[PDB]
């Protein structure tokens, strides 16, 4: 998150922190995700497409910090890693960038809701907020584009939804953005998602209910003028989500 503010997991208690174990045993952060039911976390396929093997991953819930334990957190293996079969990418734009992780602790349990661990509602189909609506984004990604390190403490910020029309203009993204994606940015371009935020939630309050409107997917640079963040538009994937989770 470029700009924004520090936070803790109580303020985003569906947020899941996803890590990968390496051949020789070191563990590194991959991406964010969101708890949509006790046994299911939703994230972005590009985060997993190089290492598609479920045994490689660890998922935490109720974690506020990148490299230390938060009291109350829960740790899970990935029982199934489900990537979208229509995924595609060109160096920039990912299409169908959506993934499901079925989670299971070493005790064979799913998430148990607590003060730090809660689910986030999915949107109704094809039901998104008006462009110009402010929404929130959360993650442990870079705080500056040139940074070498990720922040140790979780961050959040606020960005405004931008119309497909504005985002499709050649000085924005042209044809790279489709109607299965949502753009969102700050009006000053001073805050945005960045590397390491992918997979995480774009949450918007749709008539009082906090809703997973988007999943961080891509963008050119971070907080760069005329280059919004681009998010998977969750309300266009409900059948996919319902099928793969009912599983």
């Amino acid at each position: 998150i470029i700009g924004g503010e520090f936070t803790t997991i109580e303020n985003q208690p569906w947020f899941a922190a996803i890590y990968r174990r390496h051949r020789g045993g070191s563990v590194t952060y991959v991406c964010g995700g969101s708890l949509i039911s006790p046994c299911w976390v939703i994230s972005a396929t590009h985060c997993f497409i190089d290492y598609p093997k479920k045994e490689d991953y660890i998922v935490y819930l109720g974690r506020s910090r990148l490299n230390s334990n938060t009291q109350g957190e829960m740790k899970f293996e990935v029982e199934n890693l489900i990537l979208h079969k229509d995924y595609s990418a060109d160096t920039l734009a990912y299409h169908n960038d959506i993934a499901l992780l079925k989670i299971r602790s070493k005790e064979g349990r799913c998430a148990q809701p607590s003060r730090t661990i809660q689910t986030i509602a999915l949107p109704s189909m094809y039901n998104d907020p008006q462009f110009g609506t402010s929404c929130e984004i959360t993650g442990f990604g870079k705080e500056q584009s040139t940074d070498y390190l990720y922040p140790e403490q979780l961050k959040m910020t606020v960005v405004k939804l931008i119309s497909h029309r504005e985002c499709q203009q050649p000085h924005y993204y042209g044809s790279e953005v489709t109607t299965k994606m949502l753009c969102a940015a700050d009006p000053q371009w001073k805050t945005d998602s960045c590397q390491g935020d992918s997979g995480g939630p774009l949450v918007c309050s749709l008539q009082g209910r906090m809703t997973l409107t988007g999943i961080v997917s891509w963008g050119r640079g971070c907080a760069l003028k005329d280059k919004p963040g681009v998010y998977t538009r969750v309300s266009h994937f409900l059948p996919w989500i319902r099928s793969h989770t009912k599983e």
Partner: peptide, 10 residues
């Protein structure tokens, strides 16, 4: 220039 997700403009 081109052109990666995430990092720099170029």
């Amino acid at each position: 220039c081109p052109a990666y997700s995430x990092y720099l403009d170029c």
